[PDB]
Structure 1
Amino acid sequence: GITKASLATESFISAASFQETTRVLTEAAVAGKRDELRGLKENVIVGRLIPAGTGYAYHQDRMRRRAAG
């Protein structure tokens, strides 16, 4: 289903945004979660560039920096 796919997500923060943040972060902090910051929203809240638009061209540089530390 649509909304359940929104909730049932790889990451948790955009999931933690808008619809029952409670259960999200409960089942997250028990689990030792960590998101790896490739969603848009994920880069919105920090205010960093999106991995996208104009910014994909730099986010790819960041991605090969993730490869090259």
Structure 2
Amino acid sequence: WLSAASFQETTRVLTDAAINCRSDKLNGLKENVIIGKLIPAGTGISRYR
């Protein structure tokens, strides 16, 4: 939902997430940059970090 809200109707996505109480795992590039975490690609994966 964190990535979905980037390019979708934020209110609708947030409402659907809140009602479902589902959690987003931070696997990807769109959501990680928002959180400030280093991207899970290239040098940023756990294998090399």
Runs of 4 or more consecutive aligned structure 1 residues displaced over 2 Å after TM superposition? 59-62
CA RMSD after TM alignment: 1.9
Q: Which structure has the highest helix share of the two?
A: 1
State TM-score, norm by structure 1.
Answer: 0.60
Q: Which runs of 5+ in 2 are unaligned?
A: none
Mapped partners of 1:36, 1:55: distance in 2: 16
Structure 1 position 60, deviation (Å): 3.9
Distance 2:30 2:19 in 1: 23
> Structure 2 length as normaliser, TM-score?
0.78
Change (3 A) 1:60 1:23: farther
Alignment of 1:35-46 (within 5 A): 35-46=24-35
SS at match of 1:54: helix
What is the aligned-residue identity percentage?
A: 67
Tell me which structure has the larger Cα radius of gyration: 1
> Number of residues paired by the alignment?
49
Aligned-partner residue type, residue 47 of structure 1: G
